Amino acid sequence: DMSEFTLKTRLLAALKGEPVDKVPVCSVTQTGIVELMDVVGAPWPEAHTNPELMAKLALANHELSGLEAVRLPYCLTVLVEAMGCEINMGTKNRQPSVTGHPYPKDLEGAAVPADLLQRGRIPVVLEAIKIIREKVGPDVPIVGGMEGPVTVASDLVSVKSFMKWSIKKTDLLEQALDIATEASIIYANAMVEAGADVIAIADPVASPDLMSPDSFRQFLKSRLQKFASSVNSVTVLHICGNVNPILSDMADCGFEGLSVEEKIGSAKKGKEVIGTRARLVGNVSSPFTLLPGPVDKIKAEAKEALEGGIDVLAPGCGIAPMTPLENVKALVAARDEFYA
Numbered sequence: 001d002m003s004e005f006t007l008k009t010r011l012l013a014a015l016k017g018e019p020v021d022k023v024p025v026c027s028v029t030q031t032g033i034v035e036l037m038d039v040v041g042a043p044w045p046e047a048h049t050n051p052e053l054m055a056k057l058a059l060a061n062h063e064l065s066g067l068e069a070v071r072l073p074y075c076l077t078v079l080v081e082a083m084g085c086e087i088n089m090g091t092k093n094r095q096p097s098v099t100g101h102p103y104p105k106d107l108e109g110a111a112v113p114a115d116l117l118q119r120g121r122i123p124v125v126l127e128a129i130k131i132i133r134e135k136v137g138p139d140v141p142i143v144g145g146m147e148g149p150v151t152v153a154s155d156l157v158s159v160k161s162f163m164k165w166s167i168k169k170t171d172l173l174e175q176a177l178d179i180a181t182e183a184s185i186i187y188a189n190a191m192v193e194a195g196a197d198v199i200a201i202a203d204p205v206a207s208p209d210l211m212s213p214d215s216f217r218q219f220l221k222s223r224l225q226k227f228a229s230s231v232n233s234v235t236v237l238h239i240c241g242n243v244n245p246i247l248s249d250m251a252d253c254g255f256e257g258l259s260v261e262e263k264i265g266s267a268k269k270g271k272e273v274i275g276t277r278a279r280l281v282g283n284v285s286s287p288f289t290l291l292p293g294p295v296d297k298i299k300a301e302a303k304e305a306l307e308g309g310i311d312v313l314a315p316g317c318g319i320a321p322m323t324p325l326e327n328v329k330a331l332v333a334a335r336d337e338f339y340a
């Protein structure tokens, strides 16, 4: 059976810690790059709103790069926009970002709407998953990406209020977190229904760079656990920054895989504190290695990750849009060279 893996079965097995023939190489974070936008005719920002173009751009960084999955969409704003956040849609090389927060003072009116799945670009993402499945077939995995519940709550109330309430109005923090989690689960299961094989949430606001490890444990962990156990899929939890102080807690959250940056140090250092509770995904620096290169540095840092027991070889965060195609190929070549 070790000789019969598909790209899909290898990723799922790897994330679950089952035996595999080799470590898979892919990205669970955003994969839109300028060089590919130009090659296949699917540039931002149009690729965020047109499902066919969203599909094409995502496909390109599988077919033309060798990454062993397809990942969509390209931003952390689809769900929060659907929940009332105002968004700036960015540019050809700048991601959409949140500019307006609907609930900076109180949660009056914040309930999750019955028509959530019809709002904003949620229908675009769901359709793009179906289109991508058509284009790659059943044996290549589709990773559905989204902002996580902590980041959703914070986007809804503004990060200033979120941080303030964490100390001074913890009941409101919790209410915001519960609404955010409920909406996140509904969206994540919708993506599973549409064809996603893995749901990979990115929750930067849960990072120790922004929230204390103690507040992670006290308030955030239980919602991340509720998310993982309510979503009917293998899941991955991505949190950037130096997450070492919460890495064990991340490993308790019910996600099969933990996606981390280079800021944890070597993959081995991470493996040594999570044991068999969760698998590790990463961790080659997106801005400081994949973006500038050189190819040889990408490969060396990738090989260190593999030697340290990384379960899925991946960029540490979103691929920087100006990343050359050749640098993405380098990540794949490193895995291939590793197995001789």
Ligand SMILES: O=S(=O)(O)CCS
Pocket: 028, 029, 030, 074, 075, 076, 202, 203, 204, 240, 317, 318, 319
């Ligand atoms: O993958 S993304 O670049 O969209 C976000 C990472 S925190």
Ligand SMILES: [Zn+2]
Pocket: 202, 204, 238, 239, 240, 316, 317, 318
């Ligand atoms: Zn990140």
